[PDB]
Structure 1
Amino acid sequence: HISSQQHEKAIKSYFDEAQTQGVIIIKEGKNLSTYGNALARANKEYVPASTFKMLNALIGLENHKATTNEIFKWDGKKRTYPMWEKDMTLGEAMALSAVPVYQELARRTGLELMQKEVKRVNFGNTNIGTQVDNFWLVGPLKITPVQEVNFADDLAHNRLPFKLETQEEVKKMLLIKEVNGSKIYAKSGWGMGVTPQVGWLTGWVEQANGKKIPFSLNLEMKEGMSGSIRNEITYKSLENLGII
């Protein structure tokens, strides 16, 4: 069938075509595979941006700072996007990347509990600093693409140190696509408050046979670039490798 060389060339071209620099790590069982046009990004640290929402949710639910049915009401103040000017649950906010909701959840958790929980889960460099409501957007919290795909691997298999129910609740919030009997769970991310800007799409594919294949795409976001480029390159890569 297809040679490794051909797969590597195809996926690298997906990043080349988007005129950006990026990498996508795929994990099968315990083996990591790095693809893309800037492989060294694999072990470099970047702010997690919205990918942190996955953990924010885990923490909030576990520590009873919210429930999956609770509706977070829009305070009526102007928001970056009109789509965020509404009342939503944690899951709706996850799908809409509604930062205001997760900033409220972070504030409910509190700096002390948050630092302690991030440390406990051993997420990235585990340092949240002194600002409980923006540490995942502008630092000091950072994480590498390898750590992100491993975090996705752990959540997909319920290995994180949270009740099985909590993990299951959050995973249900991450279904973003179904393709040929395959289900794609993932959370996107875009650190716009950092330079250069980082883009993420972390999650996993659940194949019909029940096997789960974690992944983490990480690239540099540039002005005039569509957020859906993260999704397109991820889907093309996954498909080129026969994952979906």
Structure 2
Amino acid sequence: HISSQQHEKAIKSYFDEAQTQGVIIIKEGKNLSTYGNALARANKEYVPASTFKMLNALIGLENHKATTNEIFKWDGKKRTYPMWEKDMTLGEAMALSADPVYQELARRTGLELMQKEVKRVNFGNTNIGTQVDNFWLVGPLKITPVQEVNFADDLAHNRLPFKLETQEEVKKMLLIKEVNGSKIYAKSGWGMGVTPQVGWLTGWVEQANGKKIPFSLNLEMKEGMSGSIRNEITYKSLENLGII
């Protein structure tokens, strides 16, 4: 009974109140809905940053460069964040968004196979350039919020061109929240070495009844913003719309 004008206003205000510019795309069935305080971002290209980890893991697992219980050892070198200084599975690394593990996995895949697989699944502008272990951070790979939500929709419904088992193993890594019999699966992203900086949270909601509603939030991150503003705007938006 809440008007769409009111939903649009409330979700715009969540971005306004985080002092950022952003959009959140929701897809119900085949219909895309765009909300937020910067709608024109929906079809603009940004680096995928750590959202690329979902496809890196699909490619690595499909091509047997890793398994889901293999432990990627910390090599003992200092990492940007102390929580990355430990040994972890692809799964743990997904939740911590640990770039060093994903960089190692990309190097096992190698530049040639990586290029072929990123073209094969049709991700973003599909260009990875000549450096297998940084193309998702500063270019040249870019992707729009519409393309990210369509990727999430594909993964949520096992539609990507990988085995069903590869897709389920990656999906199991992405569970971030359970809210009233609803499950939220998502990957966050924060591209710090592009200007302006870009924040992402892309995934889907699995409702109690089995329906999956994919989303993609995309915003401008600014110095001394907390990463958790991405989750908060998302949960508020999905709750406002009655998806969770």
What TM-score, normalized by structure 1, do the two folds share? 1.00
Per-residue CA shift, 1:10-68, capped at 9, x if unaligned? 00000000001000000000000000000000000000000000000000000000000
What residue number does 1:133 align with?
133
Q: How far 1:172 moved relative to its partner?
A: 0.1
RMSD: 0.2
In structure 2, distance between residues paired with 1:239 and 1:100: 34
Q: How far 1:185 moved relative to its partner?
A: 0.1
Per-residue CA shift, 1:148-201, capped at 9, x if unaligned? 000000000000000000000000000000000000000000000100000000
1:239 paired with 2:233, answer no
Give the aligned length. 244
In structure 1, distance between residues paired with 2:19 and 2:86: 35
In structure 2, distance between residues paired with 1:131 and 1:240: 42
In structure 1, distance between residues paired with 2:196 and 2:173: 29
In structure 1, distance between residues paired with 2:91 and 2:161: 20
What residue number does 2:146 align with?
146
Q: How far 1:114 moved relative to its partner?
A: 0.1
What residue number does 1:40 align with?
40
The sequence identity of aligned pairs, in percent, is 100
Gaps of 5+ in 1: none
In structure 1, distance between residues paired with 2:157 and 2:170: 12
| Runs of 4+ with deviation above 6 angstroms | none
Q: How far 1:227 moved relative to its partner?
A: 0.2
In structure 2, distance between residues paired with 1:158 and 1:224: 37
In structure 1, distance between residues paired with 2:234 and 2:163: 30
In structure 2, distance between residues paired with 1:238 and 1:17: 17
In structure 2, distance between residues paired with 1:138 and 1:59: 21
In structure 2, distance between residues paired with 1:175 and 1:235: 14
Which secondary structure does the structure 1 equivalent of 2:136 belong to? helix
